[PDB]
Design a protein that fits this description.
Chain B: This is Blue-light-activated histidine kinase. It is classed as structural genomics, unknown function. Keywords: Two-component sensor histidine kinase protein, Structural genomics, PSI, mcsg, Protein Structure Initiative, Midwest Center for Structural Genomics, Kinase, unknown function. It forms a dimeric assembly. Two copies of one chain form a homodimer. A five-stranded antiparallel β-sheet of chain A has the order 2-1-5-4-3. Chain A is of the alpha+beta class. Helix content of chain A is 42%, strand content 25%. In chain A, helix 1 runs antiparallel to helix 4 and helix 2 packs antiparallel against helix 3 (74-83). The two termini of chain A are 18 Å apart. The first copy, chain A, has helices at residues 4-19, 45-51, 74-83, 115-141, and strands spanning 23-29, 35-41, 62-64, 87-95, 98-107. Chain A has a single domain (1-144), classed as GAF domain (Beta-Lactamase, 2-Layer Sandwich). The interface between A and B is medium-sized, with 27 and 27 residues.
């Protein structure tokens, strides 16, 4: 049965070669409008639990170069620091310009982002977006 | 029900959006060791039948660029095949899984073209992601045995 689950891990593979940071995640909206993990590596189960209900959201990247110099809640923040995360990249996934979810990169030390990384990161998010668009779609259609 | 002909089409989507070239394709090895189109746009079938075979490589592969066909190292026949298709420039990016060549994906340009570092980086990125998508997706199909 259809495994975009294999595409998610593939993308996690590609993120870690392409962008050489310590962990990564993919999340997508559920019907409630809340972002949910569909794929991770290697953030712990304890962190993903803490955070699952909480992030979002015209669709552009977001970079926390240091969680300290960062306007988060002290609640959310100790979760992040607790996991051993010092920096974060948020990268939108879209269909038809609809925000559909995001992927995330995580760093143990603070981090500044090159144009080249951001570019690769954007190309990754582009492909996932289309992968999900096409896999979802004609599984919708291989029915009618 | 491996319709990840959808992974191929998505890739072709990403190739177009990330690299603004004129045409693109994916080719994979077959059991005779020969390279074979598995997806493309807008190459013609005539072209595709025409040029199966050549694998610019044979254990540690880099991208190959051809900025002007007229200035490339091609046998008469194979240069005639490209130009008659209407192509002037091409990019070969190896597809690799577990440290081995499995295929390639190609960007084509109808007029000469110098390859900007940025687009090379983008292209490589996509080439990794195809590799990995293939690695994992047939891995799943095989597992179920």
């Amino acid at each position: 049965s259809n495994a975009i689950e294999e595409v998610y891990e593939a993308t996690l593979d590609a993120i870690q070669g392409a962008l050489n940071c310590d962990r990564a995640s993919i999340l997508l909206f559920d019907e409630a409008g809340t972002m949910r993990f569909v794929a991770a590596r290697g953030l712990s189960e304890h962190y993903q639990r803490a955070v699952d209900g909480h992030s979002p959201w015209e669709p552009e990247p977001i970079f926390v170069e240091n969680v300290d110099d960062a306007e988060f809640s002290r609640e959310l923040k100790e979760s992040i620091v607790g996991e051993g995360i010092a920096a974060l990249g948020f990268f939108p996934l879209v269909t038809e310009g609809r925000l559909i979810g995001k992927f995330m990169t995580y760093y143990d030390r603070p981090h500044r982002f090159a144009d080249s990384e951001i570019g690769m990161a954007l190309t990754i998010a582009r492909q996932l977006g289309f992968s999900i668009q096409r896999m979802r779609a004609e599984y919708a259609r291989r029915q009618a």
